DNA sequence: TGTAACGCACTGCCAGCGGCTCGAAATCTCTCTCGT
DNA sequence: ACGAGAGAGATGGGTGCGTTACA
C-alpha cells in the first residue's frame, strides 16, 4: 500500500494528528503535545507530491523512549504497523478509504536541532553537509555533532542556530539540495 | 506502644552509647555525637507513638551495612522492615513493646536530614511547596534546582532554614 | 553520508551443561504503603 | 511535598551480519 499524496492532503493529515497522538505508558494513556510534534521529510520541504508522511515526536525524558513508539495510539484512525522500535515506527493508515504510509520518529530534547536538520533532508543535501564535516574530521547525525567519537557541546536550541554553528548558510527547507 | 516524652528521652539517653553494627566481621560502635533524636520527641510532644533516631554515616560505602546489620547491647528487638535508610524496629523495654525507627544520612546531608526528620509533616509540606513555586526541590538529601544540587554554604539546621528564606523556630513551634 | 528495525547464524555460557526451546533464576520497574 | 522498603510484575544470552528502509 502507501499510495501517493498531495501536499495539501499531507498538511491536512498532519493537522488531523496534531491532537490525536498518545501512547500507552503503564496504566495511563499519555497525550502527545502538538508542540512536541514536528513535521519533517518531503512535507516540510514543501514538495508538491508526497510519498509518505513524516512526523518527529520530541520525547522529554530519555527513559520514555521504550514506551512511546512501541505503544503509539491514534484516536479514531485505523493504522497497521509495518515495523516499530524506539526510534522509527512505520505505520499504514487509512485516510478517506485510501492507504497512506505514516512514519514516526523520536528525539530527546537535547538532540532536537540535529534531528530536525536530519529528518528535513533531503539525502543529497545531507550528503553534501556531512561529507564536508567529515573532511574536517567530524561526524554529523540525528543525535548530535561528534569529533573523534566525542559529542561536541554546542550552545544551540534551534535548527537555524545549528546550521550557523556548523559553518553553513541557512536555506529554507524547500531550497535545500 | 505508647510513651510519655520523659520515658522517650530516657530510652534515647540509654541508647546513645549502646549503638553498633556488624561490618564484615568487625563490630563498629556508633558515636553519640553522630546520633540525633528526631520526630515527635525532638518536637517535645507530650505523648509519643514511637522513637526516631538519625544516624550520621561518614562514608557512602558504609550505608549498606550500618542499618541492615544494626546492633544494640543487651536488648531483644524484632525487626519489622529494614534498608540502608529506614529501619523500623520493635524493642522490648521493661517487657513492653515500643517502636523504634532508625534513619541514616551522610555528613553533607546532615542539616537537610535533621530538618526533614524533625517535621512535622504539615510544616515540611508548607516549606517544600513554597520552594517548589520558585523552581526548587527540597528533600532529606539536599536542596535542588532544575535537577541540580544547589550547594549551600551552611552547616547547621538553623543556618539551612535562614538560607532557605524562612524564620527559624524551635521544633515544638513548627507547623 | 549516517542510522534504524528485523530475521538469522554462530556461538557463549548458563536454568538446563546440551541446547538454542521453554521458561529458570535473578534482577529490574511499578505500585502500595509507609515515614517525616 | 518528597522519598524508602517491600512485594508484585515483567523479563527471557550476546554479538554481529545482511537486508530493507529512513532522512
Ligand atoms: Pb541459555
Author numbering:
A (entry chain A): -2 to 174
B (entry chain B): 0 to 174
Authors' description from the paper:
Crystals of one DNAzyme/native DNA complex and DNAzyme-(2′-OMe-G) were grown in the absence of PbCl2, whereas the crystals were grown in the presence of PbCl2 for another DNAzyme/native DNA complex structure, which captured one Pb2+ ion and is referred to as DNAzyme-Pb2+ hereafter. Among the three structures, DNAzyme-Pb2+ complex diffracted to the highest resolution (2.55 Å) and refinement resulted in a well-defined electron density for all the nucleotides. The DNAzyme-Pb2+ crystal adopts C2221 space group, it contains two Dz36-substrate complexes per asymmetric unit; each Dz36-substrate complex was clamped by two AsfvPolX molecules at the blunt ends. In the DNAzyme-Pb2+ complex structure, one Pb2+ ion was captured in the catalytic core. The Pb2+ ion coordinates with the O6 atom of G6, which forms G6:C12 pair identified structurally. Interestingly, the Pb2+ ion also coordinates with a water molecule interacting with the O5′ atom of G+1. While the distance between the Pb2+ and the water is 2.5 Å, the distance between the water and the O5′ atom of G+1 is 3.2 Å, indicating a hydrogen bond formation. This observation suggests that the 8–17 DNAzyme may catalyze the RNA cleavage reaction via the Pb2+ indirectly assisted mechanism and the Pb2+-coordinated water plays an important role in the catalysis. Besides orientating, coordination with the Pb2+ ion may also reduce the pKa of the water molecule; this water molecule may then serve as the general acid and provide a proton to the O5′ atom of G+1 for the O5′ leaving, thereby accelerating the RNA cleavage reaction. Due to the possible quick decay of the crystal and the dynamic binding with the DNAzyme, the occupancy (40%) of Pb2+ is not very high in our DNAzyme-Pb2+ structure.
Besides 10–23 DNAzyme, 8–17 DNAzyme can also efficiently catalyze the cleavage reaction of RNA substrate, forming the 5′-product with a 2′,3′-cyclic phosphate at the 3′-end and the 3′-product with a hydroxyl group at the 5′-end; similar structural features are also observed on the cleavage products of the naturally occurred hammerhead, hairpin, and hepatitis delta virus (HDV) ribozymes. Interestingly, the same catalytic motif of 8–17 DNAzyme has been independently isolated under different selection conditions and using different cation cofactors, indicating that this small DNAzyme is efficient and its catalytic core motif is ubiquitous in the sequence space. The central catalytic core of 8–17 DNAzyme is flankedbytwo substrate-recognizing arms, which bind to the RNA substrate via the canonical Watson–Crick base pairing. The Dz36/substrate complexes assemble into a “V” shape with two arms (P1 and P2) orientated ~70° with respect to each other in all the three structures. Unexpectedly, the catalytic core forms a compact small DNA pseudoknot consisting of two short duplexes (P3 and P4) perpendicular to each other.
